[PDB]
Design a binder for this molecule. Structure first.
Ligand SMILES: Nc1ncnc2c1ncn2[C@@H]1O[C@@H]2COP(=O)(O)O[C@H]3[C@@H](O)[C@H](n4cnc5c(N)ncnc54)O[C@@H]3COP(=O)(O)O[C@H]2[C@H]1O
Lengths: 349, 349
């Protein structure tokens, strides 16, 4: 979905005076056919009849005008009403797959001029936006709230399962009993969860000002999940991996690749092709997750800690003095590392 | 109103199945937009979308299809329905005086193709027919009947006054006391009566089958007025006048010139400059009106009677023996001429 078109969709998103007018028009079963231009003179050959207005835009004015037959011409910045009650005459030879004169005119006119045209028919409650060779149908808020509320409820269930997987993983991590199956299962659930977020994003955007609570909910449910998955990938990949690399593996499984167990464990660098194999592959966390998240050790410095001790298990055996040899670890960070791991072992295992 | 257009108007006149369908369509407040062509696949460029039907016409089929959006395509003789639900796309650059997409389309397409296009708007009850550069509005029957009923009632009054003038003139004629004013006064009323018939004629045509009674009424009211006015012109023009010329006089004051007293007398060959002079000009009927109408003498033979006796006054003094000396007058025509005049002189004077 081009960014060019997304800028146009903003024009009619909940919160704008234009959208407010269009909601009133839909509510009254008036139709609408609206043409957005910056220089009316340049387009005087596709504009016939009607009334020259040249007056400041308002929602109420647009509403009143739409009671009349034909079309309305506004400035692109939606600050002026230029014409009302006009006949729009785009080139009839331009292909269109729309139905009815109103929507066939709209799509032809947008194709012909490279401008936005908005059509509302009298009996439906959708707003059809046309820009160049684009068509975007904009939905009512109540339809969008419904899908988004469902998506959020779905995200809650994925997130709860993710937390359960993770808390079990933690236990296994601290006891050094993790298998590849355990990692992959946890990553998959994380990947799927953020996929759902990506898929609902267009709905969220369409909601405009009415999507504010929805965005807050997404943010709260997904807050640290991306960082968490990146750290897991750095901790459990077959060979050592830089952060931005792990970030890309996340990007890949969120958007382009399917998060099947074999696919994940393969891209983590393991050579398995049967799902049952994962249970037999023993893995040991590098320790990045615990270092950044719990001991609050910056990644740049955690590299050196992993450089020296290789795995979490060995880090958990190091004394404060042992840790202090690392490039970046003073007594502050050394006790942070030492005490936070041991605290965790005590309470969790 | 060119004969070419009148033929097309017949297509939608009361009585035709097409008009019966348009009537229902008007009554249901469906609109209509109908394109008449014999070769559909040649007009492929101006007809988009819709359904190809190619089915035999009926009023009920047309009505049913008019429920759908857009336009309908029929054969020029209204025998086939070719398309329904189509989008008509005439050249947008053709000048049009119409208002609304429907009527602006109809006019432009009619001009572009030389074919009939019919448009009915949803809330108005008229049928607008476009043919080439012609536009003809066809009215509802109740409207036409009201005008025609008034026009006929108006005619009864003119006709009553014409009769009263005529019978007064009859008396003056039989007593040889006719002035040019009496003649002109009678002619003028007859002229005006026939003008009214001319003005109402388009409404009557427009009424189609619903104008049968109205035609009979006009026929009864005017059936011999024209012949009567022709014979008056032949009896009172200053210089002898052939029948053909007299009919051309009649035709002139019915259409071209206005039947003013001075003007009528001037055309009759009397150098008059003021209406008050008409009362001083004495005239004598040659006798054609009486010879044709009352004695049943053919005009051809009439001339021979007039060339001999010059005026009605002299004819009324001629004996049977005198009259038989005329070419074409046997003993029966002679006694027909003499007894009909003496009979009228006895009864009317
Ligand atoms: N070229 C054509 N070919 C076939 N049928 C034609 C036609 N032009 C008009 N009609 C028919 O007349 C109906 C009423 O059009 P109206 O202009 O009143 O109402 C129109 C008009 O107010 C507006 N609108 C549509 N096209 C427009 C255009 N090019 N320019 C400006 N306004 C337009 O959309 C309304 C709904 O049109 P809708 O199609 O439902 O219904 C149309 C359509 O069925």
């Amino acid at each position: 979905v081009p960014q060019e078109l997304i800028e146009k969709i903003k024009l009619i998103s909940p919160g704008t005076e234009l959208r407010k007018a269009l909601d009133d028009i839909i509510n009254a079963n008036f139709g609408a056919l609206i043409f957005l231009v910056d220089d009316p003179k340049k387009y005087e050959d596709v504009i016939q009849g009607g009334f020259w207005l040249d007056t400041d835009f308002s929602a109420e004015k647009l509403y009143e005008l739409s009671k009349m037959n034909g079309a309305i011409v506004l400035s692109e910045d939606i600050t002026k009403i230029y014409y009302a009650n006009v006949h729009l005459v785009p080139d009839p030879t331009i292909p269109t797959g729309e139905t009815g004169t109103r929507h066939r005119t709209a799509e032809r006119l947008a194709k012909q001029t490279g401008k936005v045209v908005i059509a509302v028919s009298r009996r439906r409650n959708i707003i059809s936006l046309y820009y160049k060779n684009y068509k975007y149908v904009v939905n009512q808020v109540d339809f969008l709230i419904s899908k988004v509320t469902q998506a959020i409820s779905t995200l809650e269930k994925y997130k709860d399962n993710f937390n359960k997987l993770l808390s079990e993983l933690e236990v296994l991590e601290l006891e050094n009993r993790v298998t590849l199956a355990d990692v992959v299962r946890t990553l998959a659930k994380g990947f799927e969860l953020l996929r759902i977020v990506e898929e609902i994003r267009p709905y969220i955007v369409e909601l405009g000002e009415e999507g504010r609570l929805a965005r807050m909910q997404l943010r709260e449910l997904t807050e640290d999940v991306d960082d968490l998955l990146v750290l897991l990938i750095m901790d459990y990949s077959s060979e050592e991996v830089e952060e931005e690399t792990a970030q890309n593996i996340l990007q890949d499984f969120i958007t382009r690749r399917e998060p099947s167990p074999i696919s994940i464990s393969r891209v983590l660098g393991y050579d398995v092709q049967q799902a049952a194999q994962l249970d037999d592959v023993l893995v040991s966390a590098r320790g990045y997750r615990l270092l950044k998240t719990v001991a609050r050790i910056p990644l740049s410095i955690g590299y050196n800690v992993v450089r020296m001790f290789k795995t979490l298990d060995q880090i958990s055996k190091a004394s404060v003095e042992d840790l202090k040899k690392v490039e970046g670890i003073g007594e502050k960070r050394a006790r942070a590392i030492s005490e936070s791991i041991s605290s965790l072992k005590h309470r969790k295992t």
